């Protein structure tokens, strides 16, 4: 296969490799979260 | 010069050749294909 790169460093066909991994939602510890466009600090506990 | 590292380069098997060579800072440091591997780092001038 041949990858032709039109309009390099512009547009919207992007790569998510250098986007922070979702990782794990750490619980019972303080974290500086950024959830869906809003930031803060808090402690997470899982519930149903 | 003594105490300096040579230009980082790598040999890869391409065009059925065993010693096809690739190097950092290509094509030039301004339009570099990747500033991460290039030893020349872009830097704005500070005050003074």
């Amino acid at each position: 296969s041949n990858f032709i790169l039109n309009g390099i460093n512009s547009g919207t066909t992007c790569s998510n490799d250098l986007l922070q991994p979702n990782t794990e939602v750490f619980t019972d510890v303080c974290v500086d979260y950024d959830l869906y466009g809003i930031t803060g600090q808090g402690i997470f506990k899982e519930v149903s | 010069p003594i105490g300096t590292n040579y230009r980082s380069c790598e040999s890869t098997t391409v065009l059925d050749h065993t010693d096809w060579c690739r190097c950092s800072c290509l094509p030039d440091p301004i339009t570099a294909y990747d500033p991460r591997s290039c030893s020349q780092k872009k830097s704005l001038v500070g005050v003074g």
Binding site: S1, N2, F3, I4, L5, N6, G7, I8, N9, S10, G11, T12, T13, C14, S15, N16, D17, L18, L19, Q20, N22, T23, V25, F26, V29, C30, V31, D32, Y33, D34, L35, Y36, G37, Q41, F44 | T12, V14, D16, L26, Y33, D34, R36, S37
Partner: protein, 97 residues
């Protein structure tokens, strides 16, 4: 009795979530199609306005070799493009060169 300045526990880890906005490119789903064309009738697909991960794409296609001309594989990571034009076919073994 002096009430000292209120301190705060410094956050340990960071958590980030965002809807990916644009759809996934699914380049692996088009490269892994079992109905591959010959070089005579080569197929073309344009990937525009979508999100992709070449680190995962190479694992999902089982890459034999990857190289770039007038560009580098390291700069594909985190970069945006107007459109990626992709052309594919099976290789007749004696013509690999």
């Amino acid at each position: 009795v002096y009430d000292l300045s209120g301190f705060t526990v410094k956050p340990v880890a960071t958590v980030h979530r965002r809807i990916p906005d644009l759809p996934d490119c699914d380049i692996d789903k088009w490269l892994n199609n079992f109905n591959v064309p010959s070089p005579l009738n080569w197929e073309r697909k344009i990937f525009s306005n979508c999100n992709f991960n070449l680190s995962t794409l190479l694992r999902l296609v089982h890459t034999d070799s990857f190289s770039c001309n007038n560009f580098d594989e390291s700069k594909i990571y985190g970069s945006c493009f107007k459109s990626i034009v992709l052309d594919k076919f099976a290789i007749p073994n004696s013509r690999r060169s």
